[PDB]
């Protein structure tokens, strides 16, 4: 399992991080993202959360937190990866999404982004 697995780990191309949530879930801390389309197109917002003590995406929680804050202070176009069907806490899945934040790119063009993608 890796951030670049195009079959399992999907991405959402050029997006900008609009909102940012931090909180405490059972056991530990967590944060959530509400990235929307950078160009302003109508798309379903990519709500992706990372929990400091849940799933296999816990060891990369601190790096992802700092880099999400960096790409939130700088409203860059970012290719946000996310593992789907990760969170099982039902109240967590009602207010947020099962998408688990696993990677956060730095799209600087309109045709390609840094990081792995589907061939």
């Amino acid at each position: 399992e890796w951030t670049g697995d195009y079959e399992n780990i999907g991405y959402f191309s050029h997006e900008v991080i609009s909102e940012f949530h931090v909180g405490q879930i059972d056991g530990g801390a967590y944060f959530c993202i509400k990235a929307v389309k950078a160009d302003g197109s109508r798309s379903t917002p990519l709500i992706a959360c990372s929990v400091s003590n849940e799933s296999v995406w816990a060891p990369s929680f601190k790096v992802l937190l700092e880099q999400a804050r960096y790409f939130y202070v700088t409203e860059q176009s970012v290719r946000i990866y996310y593992d789907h069907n990760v969170w099982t806490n039902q109240p967590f899945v009602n207010t947020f999404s099962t998408n688990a934040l696993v990677g956060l790119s730095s799209c600087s063009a309109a045709t390609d982004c840094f990081g792995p993608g589907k061939p």
Binding site: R69, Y70, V73, E75, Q76
Partner: protein
């Protein structure tokens, strides 16, 4: 919100005769915080930027007096805010409403720099207080010297306009640029050479400033550093 304070190294007999005025025609608002129209780039601001708090004036004085190359004096000038005096907050969100891109780096320096911008030459009729800022060799802290006081002030008691800046051009999308702050996160519109300082032919030849990039520093303070 009133009686904004601006630091200029000129004796009162010059400023109270030939006051602050526009140094150019760039009326855009994004480049004012970025320091592109203030002594760091094109240097053609249509706005003169003044602080509403006394503390940032001492910050400016300490920043300028602590480089061993600023040969000269300094003076805090109190200016009565007129209708042509707009706070920087209720002119950014509006630009953000129409499609402006003012990121956290730009948004974090209006609270730091209590900026009030004048879209008109600061005539001498608005200046009231001229307090000399002396850098004593003892304890090395800025002290208020002689306070020039004259009857040029006109009792209107007007307040700074809390609306949007009229005729403000269309907001610039994206363009994550330099912010150019000097000293201790002081936006480089408060620098002397962000003003129209040409009264005589060789009036004021002081060292301009070294401007650094502020947004790495804002990242330094907001992050766990």
């Amino acid at each position: 919100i009133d009686f904004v304070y601006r630091v200029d190294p000129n004796p009162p007999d010059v400023i109270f005769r030939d006051g602050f005025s526009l140094l150019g025609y760039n009326r855009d608002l994004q480049q004012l915080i970025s320091g592109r129209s203030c002594a760091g780039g094109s240097s053609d601001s249509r706005y003169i930027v003044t602080t509403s708090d006394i503390n940032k004036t001492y910050a400016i004085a300490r920043a300028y007096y602590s480089h061993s190359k600023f040969k000269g004096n300094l003076y805090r000038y109190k200016i009565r805010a007129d209708n042509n005096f707009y706070s920087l907050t209720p002119s950014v969100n509006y630009l953000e409403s129409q499609g402006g891109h003012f990121n956290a780096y730009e948004k974090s320096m209006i609270r730091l720099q209590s900026e009030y911008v004048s879209t008109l030459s600061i005539l001498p009729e608005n200046i009231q207080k001229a307090v000399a800022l002396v850098y004593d060799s003892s304890t090395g802290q800025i002290k208020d010297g002689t306070s020039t006081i004259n009857t040029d002030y006109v009792s209107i008691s007007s307040v700074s306009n809390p609306g949007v800046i009229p005729f403000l051009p269309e907001p610039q999308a994206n363009t994550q640029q330099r912010i150019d702050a000097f000293g201790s996160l002081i936006s480089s519109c408060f620098s002397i050479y962000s003003v129209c300082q040409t009264h005589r032919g060789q009036k004021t030849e002081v060292y301009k400033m070294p401007f650094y990039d502020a947004r790495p520093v804002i990242q330094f303070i907001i992050s766990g550093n």
